[PDB]
């Protein structure tokens, strides 16, 4: 399948109560492997998955120095961004940055991305050609002009097409037993009477990885997104994921309904009936 | 462009000094560099907005810098050592990527730290008229200007013809030589040439002047001795064409 | 972030090729620059690696095996005479700080089409019998040396440009206040034997 690496930076000002708080995490696919919290005691980049810990001490010295360096620049950014919008020094504000690279089933570069956000709003993003910027407002135009003069995109394109994918493949090979597996969803179905003439059918998908999954309900074989309810896929907290989908049906008619589970760990999609 | 003040400075060692730098309007990164003779610029301190980014290669024992409002910046040496004699360059970038960007430089501040002021001398200036032989041979006339006996090496020489500065026909030594090469405190001398057509030199209404701006002491430097205090001053010498 | 410019001085003739070395030693992620400073002018950028650009006829190519970023140009011009500085922005240092190399002075000697080497004597315009000697109108191949007498002062050869006439010429000056110093015995380095010594 496809694979990906993403880093997430969040920094939150707290005026009158110290420096902003900076947190960084890195993911491969749907699996966290590093974290950094500028309030935690160790002041170090830390491993969050078993395969990254065989990198050696130089990786961690390396990544810690860099993550500390970028923690300072989002600190400055909060100052700068408050000036661009002429907001007061009193209010707490947040800054986010995401970037990463995608890789295909043959492990070659697919796409790259690098975007910035201010108080939960899109501020500037690297377009798909990795050569020009999408800036939203007028304050972002300044940032766009600064980054254009600085050739930031050329530098970012070199990372995303080189360092990034190469290290993704490295992680993908060192984490082979966790990152390249497919756990088929364990499935069951539950039935709860609601009235004396209505009943809820819940279709369950447990213990599946990766997180992409499709749960669909049909009535007599025709898709039925009418009286349904479909919860967000959630982490199980041991690396696997969980999902369910429910439909309320008139009692005496449960056998007309089918749930269809589509997942990559399933050679053929799964039909379940009560 | 980047502004810097002052342009030249003489102080005694163990004294203090302050340099000032105004960045290009709206530049978030500001740099102070030290450039010793025969070397490249060496970074002293880098500012982003009003915060310090890189303090490392800055002698904190004597060097100090400030950019309180993220605009202009002041660098201070208290106290100065002889080894501090250098060109101090400030520079600025738009700031989207700090030093990974074009850096725009000011003109610099040439600082000269001395064991004492009593060695400082303005130049004497003398123009030498073109030889008849060269006229006859080439139908061109080369004037020579000597600025001699100035210390330290703080001079800008220009040529002025009929009350305008001229650049065509001019050649100024990029460096000055030592008038006695043995000494540490050796005085300097410098030459420059202005070459004009023989007809221009033969016209007795044409007026040539050689002008040497010396950068010495300020009005505040203590002066004790019988000769005049060698302050910043312009010394000129002129010649008229002659048939 | 060591940046090494091995040569301090590079002297070439107009129209000859130019290669200013630059090597660098940096364990991290670098960005490479060349900066230039023309005389009585400000230090300024010449080119940047990632711009993939050519400036004022100049190209430089990053070789990561050889860790080099040599500045190359096939046909040198006189406007190219200046100081050149290699620079490294080091991304693993705070603020991607910049480290300059030591500098290399580039001197492009002019092509004197019509040499006419002569040494003249000039007299002072104020107080009498102060006087200096001018070696002038020699080819760029003539190198000027100093004098065995350390009370005779001799300046390097210097090029002036009479632009209205489109005439270039070299010159060098010697003087002494030792009252028995002659222009005939002033420039005893290797001058042309066709040298015109004006009679007296």
């Amino acid at each position: 399948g496809s694979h990906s690496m993403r880093y997430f930076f969040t920094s939150v000002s707290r005026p009158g109560r110290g420096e902003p708080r900076f947190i960084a995490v890195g993911y491969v696919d749907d699996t966290q492997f590093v974290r950094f919290d500028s309030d935690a005691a160790s002041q170090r980049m830390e491993p969050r998955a078993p395969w990254i810990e065989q990198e050696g001490p130089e990786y961690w010295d390396g990544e810690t120095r860099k993550v500390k360096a970028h923690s300072q620049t989002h600190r400055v950014d909060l100052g700068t961004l408050r000036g661009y919008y002429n907001q007061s020094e009193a209010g707490s504000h947040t800054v986010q940055r995401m970037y990463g690279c995608d890789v295909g089933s043959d492990w070659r570069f697919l796409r790259g991305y690098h975007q910035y956000a201010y108080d939960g709003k899109d501020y500037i993003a690297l377009k798909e050609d990795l050569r020009s910027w999408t800036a939203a407002d007028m304050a972002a135009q300044t940032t766009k002009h600064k980054w254009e003069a600085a050739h930031v995109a050329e530098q970012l394109r070199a990372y995303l097409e080189g360092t990034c994918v190469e290290w993704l493949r490295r992680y993908l090979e060192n984490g082979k037993e966790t990152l390249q597996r497919t756990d088929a969803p364990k499935t069951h179905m539950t039935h709860h009477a609601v009235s004396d003439h209505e009943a809820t059918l819940r279709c369950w998908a447990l213990s599946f990885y990766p997180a992409e999954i499709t749960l669909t309900w049909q009535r007599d074989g025709e898709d039925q997104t009418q009286d349904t309810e479909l919860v967000e896929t959630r982490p199980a907290g041991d690396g696997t994921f969980q999902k369910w989908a429910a439909v309320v049906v008139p009692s005496g008619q449960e056998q007309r309904y089918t749930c269809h589970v589509q997942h990559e760990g399933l050679p053929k999609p799964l039909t379940l009936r009560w | 462009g980047v502004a810097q003040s002052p342009r030249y400075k003489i102080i005694e060692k163990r004294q203090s000094v302050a340099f000032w730098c105004n960045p290009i309007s709206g530049h978030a990164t500001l740099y102070w560099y030290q450039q010793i003779l025969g070397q490249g610029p060496k970074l002293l301190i880098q500012f982003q907005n009003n915060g310090v980014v890189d303090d490392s290669q800055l002698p904190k024992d004597r060097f100090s810098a400030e950019r309180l409002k993220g605009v202009d910046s002041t660098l201070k040496i208290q106290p100065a050592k002889l080894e501090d004699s250098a060109v101090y360059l400030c520079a600025s970038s738009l700031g989207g990527a700090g030093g990974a960007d074009t850096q725009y430089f000011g003109p610099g501040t040439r600082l000269t730290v001395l064991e004492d002021l009593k060695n400082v001398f303005p130049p004497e200036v003398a123009v030498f008229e073109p030889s008849e032989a060269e006229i006859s041979h080439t139908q061109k006339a080369t004037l020579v200007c000597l600025a001699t006996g100035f210390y330290p090496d703080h001079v800008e020489l220009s040529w002025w013809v009929n009350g305008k500065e001229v650049h065509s026909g001019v050649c100024t030594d990029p460096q000055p030589l030592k008038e006695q090469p043995a000494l540490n405190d050796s005085r300097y001398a410098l030459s420059s040439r202005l070459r004009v057509s023989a007809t221009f030199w033969q016209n007795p209404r044409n007026h040539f002047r050689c002008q040497v701006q010396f950068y010495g002491l300020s009005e505040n430097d203590e002066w004790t001795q019988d000769r005049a205090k060698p302050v910043t001053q312009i010394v000129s010498a002129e010649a008229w064409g002659r048939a | 972030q060591r940046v090494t410019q091995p040569e301090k001085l590079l002297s070439v003739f107009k129209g000859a090729p130019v290669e200013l070395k630059c090597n660098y030693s940096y364990s991290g992620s670098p960005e490479l620059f060349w900066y230039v400073q023309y005389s009585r002018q400000r230090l300024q950028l010449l080119l940047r690696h990632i711009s993939r650009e050519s400036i004022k006829g100049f190209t430089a190519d990053l070789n990561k095996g050889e860790t080099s970023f040599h500045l190359k140009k096939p046909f040198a011009q006189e406007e190219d005479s200046a100081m050149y500085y290699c620079a490294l922005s080091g991304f693993n240092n705070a603020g991607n700080m910049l480290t300059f190399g030591g500098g290399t002075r580039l001197m492009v000697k002019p092509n004197i089409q019509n040499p006419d080497p002569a040494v003249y004597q000039l007299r002072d315009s104020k107080s009498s019998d102060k006087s200096v000697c001018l070696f002038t109108d020699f080819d760029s191949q003539t190198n000027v040396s100093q004098s065995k007498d350390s009370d005779v002062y001799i300046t390097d050869k210097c090029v002036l440009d009479m632009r209205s006439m489109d005439f270039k010429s070299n010159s060098a000056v010697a003087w002494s206040n030792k009252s028995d110093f002659a222009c005939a015995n002033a420039f005893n380095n290797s001058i042309i034997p066709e040298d015109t010594f004006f009679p007296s």
């Binding site: 990544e63 980054w147 970012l156 | 990974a100 | -």
Partner: peptide, 9 residues
């Protein structure tokens, strides 16, 4: 691996 280059808005 984190990208090295330090950018500012």
């Amino acid at each position: 691996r984190l990208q090295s280059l330090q950018t500012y808005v």
